[PDB]
């Protein structure tokens, strides 16, 4: 039993809710919140820009130190950093950004990072400003993640279409 509330159950291990991931994070304070990161951990917009704003830019400060030490992530890769005031940890995961021409096949590799964590709050990877079809992203999520994932979809209109079209 966990403290995630109001989710629709999609499969044995995947749950979905129309919600702002920022507001969800502050309520549950989960062990792991997933960020829709880029390889540079530049959290300017989308989910990343919103999460970073909620940390008063502390996420960006920590991220810049991480990159200065380690260099960029791989597309499809991830790193674990602090969750600041939102969660214990933030798993920064890089899905492909279609608006950069990046290979959508790497979306499965991106979701594989979730399997290293028993429970996660997460957005749909490569959705929103990353330009991929959120319906496809949901399919890859369900077919790749085996741990317990609670998916927050900000767009109420998008949430309804994802539910109604789910196979
Ligand atoms: C274009 C849509 C793509 C899918 C989204 O779910 C991604 N953005 C977010 N998702 C969840 N909490 C959030 N809080 C702030 C942003 C945000 C909603 C927008
Ligand atoms: Cl977005």
* Ligand 2: centre distance to CA 155 (Å): 10
DSSP string, the chain: -----SPEE-SSSEEEEES-HHHHHHHH--SEEEEE--TT----SHHHHHHHHHTTTHHHHHHHHHHHHH-PPPTT-EEEEE-TTT-SEEEEE----GGGT--TTHHHHHHHGGGGSSEEEEPPTT-GGG---HHHHHHHHHHH--SEEEEEE--HHHHHHHHHT--
Using alpha carbons, select from 150, 131, 129 the residue that is nearest to residue 141. 150
- Nearest atom in ligand 1 to the alpha carbon of residue 152 is 11
Nearest Cα residue to atom 1 of ligand 1:
128
Tell how far CA 8 is from the center of its chain: 18
Tokens of 80: 């674990």
What CA–CA distances, in Å, run from 75 to 8, 61, 110, 114, 117? 30, 21, 8, 15, 19
How does strand 8-9 pair with strand 32-36?
unpaired
Domains of the chain: 8-163 (3.40.220.10)
Q: What technique determined this structure? A: X-ray
- Nearest atom in ligand 1 to the alpha carbon of residue 24 is 12
Are 39 and 28 in contact, with CB atoms under 8 Å apart?
no
| Ligand minimally distant from the alpha carbon of residue 26 | 1
Are 72 and 92 in contact, with CB atoms under 8 Å apart?
no
Listed resolution, Å: 1.0
Are 128 and 164 in contact, with CB atoms under 8 Å apart?
no
- Nearest atom in ligand 1 to the alpha carbon of residue 155 is 18
Would the CB of 50 count as within 6 Å of ligand 1? yes
Would the CB of 16 count as within 6 Å of ligand 1? no
Sign of CA dihedral 142, 123, 80, 9: negative
């Amino acid at each position: 039993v966990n403290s995630f509330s109001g989710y629709l159950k999609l499969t044995d291990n995947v749950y979905i809710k129309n919600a702002d991931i920022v507001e969800e994070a502050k309520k549950v304070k989960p062990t792991v919140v997933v960020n829709a990161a880029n390889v540079y951990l530049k959290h300017g917009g989308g989910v990343a820009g919103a999460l970073n704003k909620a940390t008063n830019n502390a996420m960006q400060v920590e991220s810049d130190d991480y990159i200065a030490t380690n260099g960029p992530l791989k597309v499809g890769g991830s790193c674990v950093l602090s969750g600041h005031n939102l969660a214990k940890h933030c798993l920064h995961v890089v899905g492909p950004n279609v608006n950069k021409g990046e290979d959508i096949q790497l979306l499965k590799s991106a979701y594989e990072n979730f399997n290293q964590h028993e429970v996660l709050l997460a957005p749909l990877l490569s959705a929103g400003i990353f330009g991929a079809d959120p319906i496809h992203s949901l399919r890859v999520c369900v077919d790749t993640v085996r741990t317990n994932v609670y998916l927050a979809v900000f767009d109420k209109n998008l949430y309804d279409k994802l539910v109604s079209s789910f196979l």
